[PDB]
PDB file of C-alpha atoms in Angstrom:
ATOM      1  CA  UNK A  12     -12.626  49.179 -40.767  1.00 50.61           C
ATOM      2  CA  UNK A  13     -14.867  49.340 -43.521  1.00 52.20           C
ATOM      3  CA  UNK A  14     -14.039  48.842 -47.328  1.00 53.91           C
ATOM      4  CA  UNK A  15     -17.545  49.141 -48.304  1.00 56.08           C
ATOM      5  CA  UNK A  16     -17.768  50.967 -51.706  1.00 54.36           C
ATOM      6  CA  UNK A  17     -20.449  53.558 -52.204  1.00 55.38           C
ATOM      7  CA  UNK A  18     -22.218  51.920 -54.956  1.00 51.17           C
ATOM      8  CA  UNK A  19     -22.839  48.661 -53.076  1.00 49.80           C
ATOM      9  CA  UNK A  20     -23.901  50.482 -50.022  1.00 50.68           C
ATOM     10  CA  UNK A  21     -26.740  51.720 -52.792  1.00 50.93           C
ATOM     11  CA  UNK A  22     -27.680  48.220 -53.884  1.00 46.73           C
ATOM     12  CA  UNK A  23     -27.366  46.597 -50.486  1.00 48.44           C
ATOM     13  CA  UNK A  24     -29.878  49.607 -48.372  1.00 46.74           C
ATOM     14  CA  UNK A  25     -32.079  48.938 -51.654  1.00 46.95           C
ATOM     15  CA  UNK A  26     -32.018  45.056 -51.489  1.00 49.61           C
ATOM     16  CA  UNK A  27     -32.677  45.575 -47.702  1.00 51.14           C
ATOM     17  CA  UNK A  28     -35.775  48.074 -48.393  1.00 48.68           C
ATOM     18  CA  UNK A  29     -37.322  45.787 -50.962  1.00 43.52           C
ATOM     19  CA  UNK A  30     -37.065  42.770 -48.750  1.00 41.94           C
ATOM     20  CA  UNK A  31     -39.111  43.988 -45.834  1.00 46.51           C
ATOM     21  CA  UNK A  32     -36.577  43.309 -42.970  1.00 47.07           C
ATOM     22  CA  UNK A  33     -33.091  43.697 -41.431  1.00 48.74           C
ATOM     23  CA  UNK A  34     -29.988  42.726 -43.741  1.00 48.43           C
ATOM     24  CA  UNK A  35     -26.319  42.012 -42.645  1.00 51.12           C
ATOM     25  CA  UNK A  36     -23.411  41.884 -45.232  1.00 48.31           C
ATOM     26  CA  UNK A  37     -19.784  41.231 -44.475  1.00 49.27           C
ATOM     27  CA  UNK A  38     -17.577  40.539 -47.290  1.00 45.83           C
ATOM     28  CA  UNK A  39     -13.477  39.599 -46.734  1.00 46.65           C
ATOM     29  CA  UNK A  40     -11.002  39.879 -49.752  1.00 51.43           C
ATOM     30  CA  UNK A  41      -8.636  37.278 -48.287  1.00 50.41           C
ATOM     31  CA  UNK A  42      -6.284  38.329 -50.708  1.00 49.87           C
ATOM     32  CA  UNK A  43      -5.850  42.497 -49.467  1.00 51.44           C
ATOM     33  CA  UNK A  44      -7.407  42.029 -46.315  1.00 49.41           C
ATOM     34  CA  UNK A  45     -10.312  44.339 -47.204  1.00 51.47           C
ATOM     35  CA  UNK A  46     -13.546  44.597 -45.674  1.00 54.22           C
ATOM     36  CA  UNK A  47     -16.681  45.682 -46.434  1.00 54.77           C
ATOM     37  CA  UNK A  48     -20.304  45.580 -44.828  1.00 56.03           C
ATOM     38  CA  UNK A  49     -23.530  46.714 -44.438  1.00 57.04           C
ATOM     39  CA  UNK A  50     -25.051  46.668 -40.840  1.00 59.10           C
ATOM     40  CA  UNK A  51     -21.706  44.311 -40.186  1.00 57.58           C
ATOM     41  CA  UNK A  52     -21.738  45.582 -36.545  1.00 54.33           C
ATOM     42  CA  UNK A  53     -25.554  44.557 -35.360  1.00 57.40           C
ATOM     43  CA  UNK A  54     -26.363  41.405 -33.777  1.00 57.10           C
ATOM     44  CA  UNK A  55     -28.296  39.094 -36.067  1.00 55.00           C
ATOM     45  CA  UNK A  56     -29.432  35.832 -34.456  1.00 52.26           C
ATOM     46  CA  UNK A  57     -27.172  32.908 -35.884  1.00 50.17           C
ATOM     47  CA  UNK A  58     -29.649  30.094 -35.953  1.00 51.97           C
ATOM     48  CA  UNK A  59     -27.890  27.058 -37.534  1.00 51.62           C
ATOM     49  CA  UNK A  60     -24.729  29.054 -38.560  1.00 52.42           C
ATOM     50  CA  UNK A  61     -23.302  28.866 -34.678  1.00 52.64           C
ATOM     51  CA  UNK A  62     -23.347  25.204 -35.707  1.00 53.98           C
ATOM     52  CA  UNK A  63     -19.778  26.068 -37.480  1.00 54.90           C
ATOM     53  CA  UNK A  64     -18.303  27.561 -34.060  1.00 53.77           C
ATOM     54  CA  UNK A  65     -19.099  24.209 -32.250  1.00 53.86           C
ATOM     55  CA  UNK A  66     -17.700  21.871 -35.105  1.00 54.13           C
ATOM     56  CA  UNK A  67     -14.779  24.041 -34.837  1.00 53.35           C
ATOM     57  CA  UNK A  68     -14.660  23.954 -31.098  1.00 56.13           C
ATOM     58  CA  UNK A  69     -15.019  20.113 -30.889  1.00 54.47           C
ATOM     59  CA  UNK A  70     -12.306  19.685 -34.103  1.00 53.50           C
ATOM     60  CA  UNK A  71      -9.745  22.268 -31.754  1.00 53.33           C
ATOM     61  CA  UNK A  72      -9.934  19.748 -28.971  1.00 55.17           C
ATOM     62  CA  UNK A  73      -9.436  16.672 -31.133  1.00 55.94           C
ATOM     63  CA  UNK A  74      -6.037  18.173 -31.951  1.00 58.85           C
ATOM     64  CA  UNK A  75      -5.042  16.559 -28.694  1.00 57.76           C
ATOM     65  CA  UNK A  76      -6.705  13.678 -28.883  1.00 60.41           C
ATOM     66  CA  UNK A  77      -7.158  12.868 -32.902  1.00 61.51           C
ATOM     67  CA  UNK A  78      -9.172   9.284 -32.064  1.00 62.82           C
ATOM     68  CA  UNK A  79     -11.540  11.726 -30.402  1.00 62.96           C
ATOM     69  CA  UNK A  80     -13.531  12.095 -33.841  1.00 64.10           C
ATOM     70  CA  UNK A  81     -13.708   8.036 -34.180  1.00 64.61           C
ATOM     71  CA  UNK A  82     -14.808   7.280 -30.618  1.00 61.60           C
ATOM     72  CA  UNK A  83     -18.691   5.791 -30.456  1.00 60.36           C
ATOM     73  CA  UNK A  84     -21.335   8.133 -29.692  1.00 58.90           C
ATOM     74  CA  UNK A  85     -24.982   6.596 -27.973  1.00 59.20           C
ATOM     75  CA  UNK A  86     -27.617   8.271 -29.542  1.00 62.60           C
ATOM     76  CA  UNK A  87     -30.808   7.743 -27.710  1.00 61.48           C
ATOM     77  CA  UNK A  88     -34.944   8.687 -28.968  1.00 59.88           C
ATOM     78  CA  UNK A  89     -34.171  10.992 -25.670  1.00 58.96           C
ATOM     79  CA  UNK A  90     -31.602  12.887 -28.023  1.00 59.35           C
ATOM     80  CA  UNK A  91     -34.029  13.522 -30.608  1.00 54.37           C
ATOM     81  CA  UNK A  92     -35.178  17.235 -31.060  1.00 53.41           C
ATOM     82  CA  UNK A  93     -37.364  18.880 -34.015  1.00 53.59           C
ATOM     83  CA  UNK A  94     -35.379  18.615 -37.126  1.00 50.27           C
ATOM     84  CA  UNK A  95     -33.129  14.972 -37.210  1.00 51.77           C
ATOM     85  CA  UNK A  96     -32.568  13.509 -40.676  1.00 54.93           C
ATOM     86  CA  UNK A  97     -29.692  11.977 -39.773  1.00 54.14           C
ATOM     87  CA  UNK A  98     -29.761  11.233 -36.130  1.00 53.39           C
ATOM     88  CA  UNK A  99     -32.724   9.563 -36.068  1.00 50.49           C
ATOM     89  CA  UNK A 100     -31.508   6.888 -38.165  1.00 50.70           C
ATOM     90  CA  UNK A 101     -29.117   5.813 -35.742  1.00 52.64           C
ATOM     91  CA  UNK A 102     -31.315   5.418 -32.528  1.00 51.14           C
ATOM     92  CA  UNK A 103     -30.283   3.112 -30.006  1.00 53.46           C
ATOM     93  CA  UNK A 104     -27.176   2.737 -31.981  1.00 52.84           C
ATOM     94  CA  UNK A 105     -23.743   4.685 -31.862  1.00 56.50           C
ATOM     95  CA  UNK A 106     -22.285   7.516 -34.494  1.00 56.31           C
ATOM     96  CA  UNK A 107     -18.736   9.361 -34.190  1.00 56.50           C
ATOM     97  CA  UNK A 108     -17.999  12.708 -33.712  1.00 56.50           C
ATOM     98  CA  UNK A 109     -17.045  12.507 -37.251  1.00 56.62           C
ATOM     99  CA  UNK A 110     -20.827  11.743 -38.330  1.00 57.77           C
ATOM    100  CA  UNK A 111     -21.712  13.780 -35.923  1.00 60.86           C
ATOM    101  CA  UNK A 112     -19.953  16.516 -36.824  1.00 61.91           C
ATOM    102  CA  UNK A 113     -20.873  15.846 -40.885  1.00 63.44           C
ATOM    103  CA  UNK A 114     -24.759  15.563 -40.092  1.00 62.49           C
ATOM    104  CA  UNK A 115     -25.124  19.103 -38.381  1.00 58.66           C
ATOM    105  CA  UNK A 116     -22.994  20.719 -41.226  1.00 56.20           C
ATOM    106  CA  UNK A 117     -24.230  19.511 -43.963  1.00 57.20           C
ATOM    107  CA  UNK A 118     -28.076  18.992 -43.241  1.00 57.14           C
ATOM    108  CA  UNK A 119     -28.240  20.975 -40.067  1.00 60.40           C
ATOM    109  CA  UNK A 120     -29.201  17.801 -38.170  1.00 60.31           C
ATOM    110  CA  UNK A 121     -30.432  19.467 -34.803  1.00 59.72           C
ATOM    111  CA  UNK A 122     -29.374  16.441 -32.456  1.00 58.26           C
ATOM    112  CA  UNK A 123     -26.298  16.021 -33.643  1.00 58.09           C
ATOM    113  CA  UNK A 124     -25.601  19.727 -32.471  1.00 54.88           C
ATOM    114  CA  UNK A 125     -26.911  18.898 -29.075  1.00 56.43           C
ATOM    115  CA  UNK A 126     -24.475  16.025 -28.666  1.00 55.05           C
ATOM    116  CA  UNK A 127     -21.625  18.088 -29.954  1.00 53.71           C
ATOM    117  CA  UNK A 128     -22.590  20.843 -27.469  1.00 50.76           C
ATOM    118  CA  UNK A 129     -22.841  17.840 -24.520  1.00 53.80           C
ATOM    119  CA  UNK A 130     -19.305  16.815 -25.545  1.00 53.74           C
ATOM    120  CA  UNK A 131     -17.989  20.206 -25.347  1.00 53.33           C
ATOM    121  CA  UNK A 132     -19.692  21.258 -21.789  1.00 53.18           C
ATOM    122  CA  UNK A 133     -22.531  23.339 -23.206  1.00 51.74           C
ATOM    123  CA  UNK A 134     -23.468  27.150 -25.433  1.00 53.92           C
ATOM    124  CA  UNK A 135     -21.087  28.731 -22.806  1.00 51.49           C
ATOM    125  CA  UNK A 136     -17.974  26.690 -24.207  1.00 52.60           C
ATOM    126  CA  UNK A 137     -18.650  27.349 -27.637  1.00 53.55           C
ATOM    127  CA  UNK A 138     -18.750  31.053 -26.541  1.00 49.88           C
ATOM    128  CA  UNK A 139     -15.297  30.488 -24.705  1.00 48.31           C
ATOM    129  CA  UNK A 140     -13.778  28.605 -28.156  1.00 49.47           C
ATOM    130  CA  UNK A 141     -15.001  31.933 -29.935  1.00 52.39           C
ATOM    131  CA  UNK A 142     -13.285  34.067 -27.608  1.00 54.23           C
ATOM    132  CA  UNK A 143     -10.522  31.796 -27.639  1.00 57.09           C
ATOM    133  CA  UNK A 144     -10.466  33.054 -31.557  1.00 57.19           C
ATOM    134  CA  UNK A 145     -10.799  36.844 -31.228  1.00 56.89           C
ATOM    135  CA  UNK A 146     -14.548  36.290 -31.775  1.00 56.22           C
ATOM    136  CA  UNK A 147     -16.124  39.301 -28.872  1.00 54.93           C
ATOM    137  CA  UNK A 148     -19.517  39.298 -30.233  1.00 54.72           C
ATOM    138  CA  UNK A 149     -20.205  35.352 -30.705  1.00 54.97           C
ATOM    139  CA  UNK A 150     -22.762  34.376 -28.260  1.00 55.91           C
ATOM    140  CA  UNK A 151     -24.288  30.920 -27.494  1.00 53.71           C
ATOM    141  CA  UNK A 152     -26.955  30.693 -24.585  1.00 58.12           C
ATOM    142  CA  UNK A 153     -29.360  28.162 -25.256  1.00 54.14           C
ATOM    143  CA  UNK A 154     -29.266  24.484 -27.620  1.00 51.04           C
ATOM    144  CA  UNK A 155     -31.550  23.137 -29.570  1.00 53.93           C
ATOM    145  CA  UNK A 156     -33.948  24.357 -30.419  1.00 54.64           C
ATOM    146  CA  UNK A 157     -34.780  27.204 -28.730  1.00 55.07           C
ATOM    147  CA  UNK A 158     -31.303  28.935 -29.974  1.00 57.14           C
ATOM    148  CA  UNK A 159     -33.460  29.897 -33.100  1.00 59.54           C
ATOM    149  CA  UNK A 160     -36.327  32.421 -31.380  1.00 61.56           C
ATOM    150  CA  UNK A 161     -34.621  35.065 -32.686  1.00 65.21           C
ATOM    151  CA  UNK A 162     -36.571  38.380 -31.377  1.00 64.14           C
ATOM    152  CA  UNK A 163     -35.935  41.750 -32.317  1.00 62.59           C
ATOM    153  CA  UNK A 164     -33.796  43.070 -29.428  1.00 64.51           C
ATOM    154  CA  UNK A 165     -32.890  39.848 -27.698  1.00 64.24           C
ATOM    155  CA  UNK A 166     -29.184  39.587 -27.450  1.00 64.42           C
ATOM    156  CA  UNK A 167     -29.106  35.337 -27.073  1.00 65.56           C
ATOM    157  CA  UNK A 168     -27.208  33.519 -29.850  1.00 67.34           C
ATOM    158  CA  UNK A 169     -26.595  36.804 -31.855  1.00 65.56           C
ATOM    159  CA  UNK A 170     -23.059  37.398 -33.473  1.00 64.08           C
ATOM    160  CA  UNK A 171     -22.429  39.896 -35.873  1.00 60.83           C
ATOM    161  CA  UNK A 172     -21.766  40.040 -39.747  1.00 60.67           C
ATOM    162  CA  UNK A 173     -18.144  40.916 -38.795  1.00 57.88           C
ATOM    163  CA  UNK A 174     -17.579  38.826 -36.518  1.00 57.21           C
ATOM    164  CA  UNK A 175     -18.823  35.707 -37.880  1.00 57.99           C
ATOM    165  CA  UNK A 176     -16.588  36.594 -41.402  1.00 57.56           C
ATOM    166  CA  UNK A 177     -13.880  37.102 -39.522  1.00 58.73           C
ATOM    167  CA  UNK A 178     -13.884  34.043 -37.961  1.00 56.89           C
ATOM    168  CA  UNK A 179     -14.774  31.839 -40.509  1.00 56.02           C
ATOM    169  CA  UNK A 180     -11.574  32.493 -42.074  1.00 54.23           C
ATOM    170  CA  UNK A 181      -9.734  32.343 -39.067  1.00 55.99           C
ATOM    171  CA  UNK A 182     -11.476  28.683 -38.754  1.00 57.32           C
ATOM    172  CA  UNK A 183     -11.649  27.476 -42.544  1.00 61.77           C
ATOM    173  CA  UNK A 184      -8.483  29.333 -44.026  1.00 62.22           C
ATOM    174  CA  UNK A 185      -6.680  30.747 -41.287  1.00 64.86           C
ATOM    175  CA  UNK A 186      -4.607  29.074 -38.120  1.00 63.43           C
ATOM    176  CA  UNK A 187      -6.996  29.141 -35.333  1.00 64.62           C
ATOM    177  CA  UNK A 188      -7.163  25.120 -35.990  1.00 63.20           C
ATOM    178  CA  UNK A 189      -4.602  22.612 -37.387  1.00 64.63           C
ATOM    179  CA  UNK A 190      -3.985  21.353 -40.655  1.00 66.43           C
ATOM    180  CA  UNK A 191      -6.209  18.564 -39.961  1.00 69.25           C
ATOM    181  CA  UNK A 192      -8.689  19.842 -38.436  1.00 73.52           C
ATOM    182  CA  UNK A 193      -9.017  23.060 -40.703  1.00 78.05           C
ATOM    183  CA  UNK A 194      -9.104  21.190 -44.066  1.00 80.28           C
ATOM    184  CA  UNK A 195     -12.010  18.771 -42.248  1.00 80.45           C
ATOM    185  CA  UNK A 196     -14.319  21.672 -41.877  1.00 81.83           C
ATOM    186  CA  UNK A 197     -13.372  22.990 -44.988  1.00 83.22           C
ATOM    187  CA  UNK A 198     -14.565  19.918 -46.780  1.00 83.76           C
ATOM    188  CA  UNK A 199     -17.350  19.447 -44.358  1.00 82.57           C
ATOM    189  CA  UNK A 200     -18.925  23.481 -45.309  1.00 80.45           C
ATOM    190  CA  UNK A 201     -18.234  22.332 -49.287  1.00 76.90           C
ATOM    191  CA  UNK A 202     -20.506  19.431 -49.379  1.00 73.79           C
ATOM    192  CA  UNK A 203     -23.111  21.196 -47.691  1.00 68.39           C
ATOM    193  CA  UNK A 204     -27.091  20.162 -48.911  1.00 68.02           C
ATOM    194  CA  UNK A 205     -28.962  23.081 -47.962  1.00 71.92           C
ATOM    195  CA  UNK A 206     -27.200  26.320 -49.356  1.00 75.73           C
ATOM    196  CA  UNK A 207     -28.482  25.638 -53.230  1.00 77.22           C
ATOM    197  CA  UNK A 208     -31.089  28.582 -53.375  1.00 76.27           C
ATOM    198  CA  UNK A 209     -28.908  31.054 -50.518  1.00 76.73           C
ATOM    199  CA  UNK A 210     -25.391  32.117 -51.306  1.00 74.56           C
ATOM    200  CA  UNK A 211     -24.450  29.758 -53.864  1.00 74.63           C
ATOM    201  CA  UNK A 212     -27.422  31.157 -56.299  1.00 77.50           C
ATOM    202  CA  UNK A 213     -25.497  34.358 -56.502  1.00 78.60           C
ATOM    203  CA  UNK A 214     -21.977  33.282 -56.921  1.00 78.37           C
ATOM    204  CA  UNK A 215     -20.878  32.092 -60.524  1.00 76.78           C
ATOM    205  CA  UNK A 216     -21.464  28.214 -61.015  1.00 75.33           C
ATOM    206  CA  UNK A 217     -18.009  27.189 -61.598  1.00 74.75           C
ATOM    207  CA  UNK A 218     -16.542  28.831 -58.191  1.00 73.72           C
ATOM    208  CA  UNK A 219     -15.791  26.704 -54.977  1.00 76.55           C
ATOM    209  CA  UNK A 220     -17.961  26.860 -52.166  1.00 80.52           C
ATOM    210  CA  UNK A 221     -17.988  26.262 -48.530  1.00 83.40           C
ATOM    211  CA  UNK A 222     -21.808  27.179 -46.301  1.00 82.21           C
ATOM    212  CA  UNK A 223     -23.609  26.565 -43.563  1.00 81.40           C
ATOM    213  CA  UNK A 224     -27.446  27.936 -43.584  1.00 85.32           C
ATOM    214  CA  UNK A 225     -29.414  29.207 -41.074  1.00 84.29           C
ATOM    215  CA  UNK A 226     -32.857  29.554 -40.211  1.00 85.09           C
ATOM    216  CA  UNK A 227     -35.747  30.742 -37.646  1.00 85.77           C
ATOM    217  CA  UNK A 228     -38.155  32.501 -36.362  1.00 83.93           C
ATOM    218  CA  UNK A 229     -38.907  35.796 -37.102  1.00 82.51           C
ATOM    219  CA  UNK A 230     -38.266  34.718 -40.530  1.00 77.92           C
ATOM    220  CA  UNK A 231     -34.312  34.855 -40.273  1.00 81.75           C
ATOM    221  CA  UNK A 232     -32.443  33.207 -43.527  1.00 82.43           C
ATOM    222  CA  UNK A 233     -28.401  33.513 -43.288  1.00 81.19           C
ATOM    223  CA  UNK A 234     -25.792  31.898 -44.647  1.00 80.89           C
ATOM    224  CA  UNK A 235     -22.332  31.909 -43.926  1.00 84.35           C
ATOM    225  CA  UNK A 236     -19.815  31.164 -46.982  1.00 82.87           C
ATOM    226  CA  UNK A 237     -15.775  30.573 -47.889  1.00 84.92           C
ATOM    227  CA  UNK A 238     -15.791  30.808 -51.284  1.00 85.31           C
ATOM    228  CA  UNK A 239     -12.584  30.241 -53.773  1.00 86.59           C
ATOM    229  CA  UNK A 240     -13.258  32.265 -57.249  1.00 85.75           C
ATOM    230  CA  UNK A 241     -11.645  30.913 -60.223  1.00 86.11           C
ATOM    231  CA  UNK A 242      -7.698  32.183 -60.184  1.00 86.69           C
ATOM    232  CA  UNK A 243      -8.170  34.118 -56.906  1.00 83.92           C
ATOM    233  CA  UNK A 244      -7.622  34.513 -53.577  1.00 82.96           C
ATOM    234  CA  UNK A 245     -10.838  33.153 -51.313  1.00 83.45           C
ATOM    235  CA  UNK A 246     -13.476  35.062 -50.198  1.00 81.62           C
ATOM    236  CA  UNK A 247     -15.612  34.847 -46.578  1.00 83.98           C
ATOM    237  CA  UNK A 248     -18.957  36.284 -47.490  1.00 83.94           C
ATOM    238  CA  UNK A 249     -21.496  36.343 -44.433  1.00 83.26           C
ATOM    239  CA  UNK A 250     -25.486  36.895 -45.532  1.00 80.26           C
ATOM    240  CA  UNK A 251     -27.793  37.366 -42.729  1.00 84.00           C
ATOM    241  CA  UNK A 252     -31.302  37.979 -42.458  1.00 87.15           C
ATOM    242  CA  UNK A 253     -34.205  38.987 -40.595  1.00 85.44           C
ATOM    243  CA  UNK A 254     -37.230  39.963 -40.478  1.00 82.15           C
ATOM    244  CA  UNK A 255     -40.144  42.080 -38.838  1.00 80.69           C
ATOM    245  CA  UNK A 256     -42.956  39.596 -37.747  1.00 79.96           C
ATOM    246  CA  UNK A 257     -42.536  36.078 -35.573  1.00 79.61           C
ATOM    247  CA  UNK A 258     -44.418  34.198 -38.656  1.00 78.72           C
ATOM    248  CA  UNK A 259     -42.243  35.316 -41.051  1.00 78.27           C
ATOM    249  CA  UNK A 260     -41.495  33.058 -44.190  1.00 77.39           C
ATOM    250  CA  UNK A 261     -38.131  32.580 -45.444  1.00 78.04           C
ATOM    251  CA  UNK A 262     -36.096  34.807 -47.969  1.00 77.64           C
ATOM    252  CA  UNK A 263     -33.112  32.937 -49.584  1.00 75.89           C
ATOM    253  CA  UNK A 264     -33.176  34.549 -52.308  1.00 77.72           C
ATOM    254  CA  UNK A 265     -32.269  37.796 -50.722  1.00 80.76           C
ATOM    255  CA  UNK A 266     -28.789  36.242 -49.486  1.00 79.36           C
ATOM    256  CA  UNK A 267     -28.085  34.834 -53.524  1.00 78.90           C
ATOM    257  CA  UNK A 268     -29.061  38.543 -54.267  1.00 78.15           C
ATOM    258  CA  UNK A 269     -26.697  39.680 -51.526  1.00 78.84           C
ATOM    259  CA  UNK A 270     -23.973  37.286 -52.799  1.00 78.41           C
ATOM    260  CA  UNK A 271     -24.214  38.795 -56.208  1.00 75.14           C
ATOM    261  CA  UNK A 272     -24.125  42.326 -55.592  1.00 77.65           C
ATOM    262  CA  UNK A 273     -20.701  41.200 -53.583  1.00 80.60           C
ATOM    263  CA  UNK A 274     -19.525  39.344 -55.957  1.00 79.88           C
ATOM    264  CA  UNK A 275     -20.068  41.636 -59.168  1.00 78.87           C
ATOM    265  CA  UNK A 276     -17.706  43.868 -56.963  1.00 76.41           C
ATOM    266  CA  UNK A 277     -14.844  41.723 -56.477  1.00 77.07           C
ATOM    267  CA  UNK A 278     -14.622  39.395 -59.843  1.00 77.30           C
TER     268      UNK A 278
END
């Protein structure tokens, strides 16, 4: 299903064109149900925003075992990776799955993903949580960092616009987790640190919002957003990005532009 108006098909193809690369737009109207995309059914590579799927994965099993979030985590110079603002403050000391949990969300703290994806036996559980969701095109293969190579035609740690918006509100607004659990993520995706210049840019200031960013090679920017408009039922916007060459420098401010020309057609 697609609920993609004519006019924004127009400004999205055009945003696309201007930008030099490959664009991916999925919008949800949590309040009809509605839909609406551009290129929502091509695998983009997720980068950092499969970082959501495992927080959710590792929150679903906690809902068995709730001191599972408190419980001490090692974290060793061995855990370190490229990118570790957080974790590497806490070497040869402990941090919970709570920290751990917070770091990768909201400053897309590399090791902490890696630990998460230890707890949870590996990219190939986080695939089975999606599944577990509805979610047929989520696909993790590989951790940190090498999930982020993102090469025209390689199908490794793709999903698709759809697919991702759908389950993002399955995950933040929906049932696929518990109360608990679902208002934790929720509150993790809000205080977010790196989504300033990506979706947020586009959406009015005085809105809610919920992210987590991505980035990689080939100069893919995403973003992945829950957003609650002023007197309105939520939206799930998804925003990804990618372009032609390995080197590739980042665009964020083709996903704010994105965000705007979706939300100019639903405020």
């Amino acid at each position: 299903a697609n609920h993609i108006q004519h006019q924004m098909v127009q400004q999205l193809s055009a945003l696309e064109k201007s930008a030099n690369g490959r664009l991916g737009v999925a919008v949800i109207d949590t309040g009809s149900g509605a839909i609406a995309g551009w290129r929502m059914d091509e695998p983009f590579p997720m980068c950092s925003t499969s970082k959501v799927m495992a927080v959710a994965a590792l929150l679903k099993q906690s809902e068995q075992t709730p001191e599972l979030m408190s419980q001490p985590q090692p974290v060793a110079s061995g855990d370190l990776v490229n990118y570790n603002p957080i974790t590497e403050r806490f070497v040869g000391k402990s941090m919970t799955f709570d920290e751990l949990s917070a770091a990768t969300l909201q400053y897309s703290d590399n090791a902490a993903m890696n630990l998460i994806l230890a707890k949870l036996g590996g990219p190939q559980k986080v695939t089975a949580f999606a599944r577990s969701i509805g979610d047929d095109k989520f696909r993790l293969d590989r951790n940190e960092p090498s999930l982020n190579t993102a090469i025209p035609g390689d199908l490794r740690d793709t999903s698709t616009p759809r697919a991702m918006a759908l389950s993002l509100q399955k995950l933040a607004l929906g049932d696929a987790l518990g109360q608990v659990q679902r208002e934790k993520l929720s509150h993790w995706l809000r205080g977010n640190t790196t989504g300033a210049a990506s979706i947020r840019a586009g959406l009015p200031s005085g809105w809610s919002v919920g992210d987590k960013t991505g980035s990689g090679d080939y100069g893919t920017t995403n973003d992945i957003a829950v957003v609650w408009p002023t007197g309105r039922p939520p939206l799930v916007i998804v925003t990804y990005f990618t372009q032609p060459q390995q080197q590739a420098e980042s665009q964020r401010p083709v996903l704010a532009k994105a965000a705007a020309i979706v939300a100019s057609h639903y405020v």
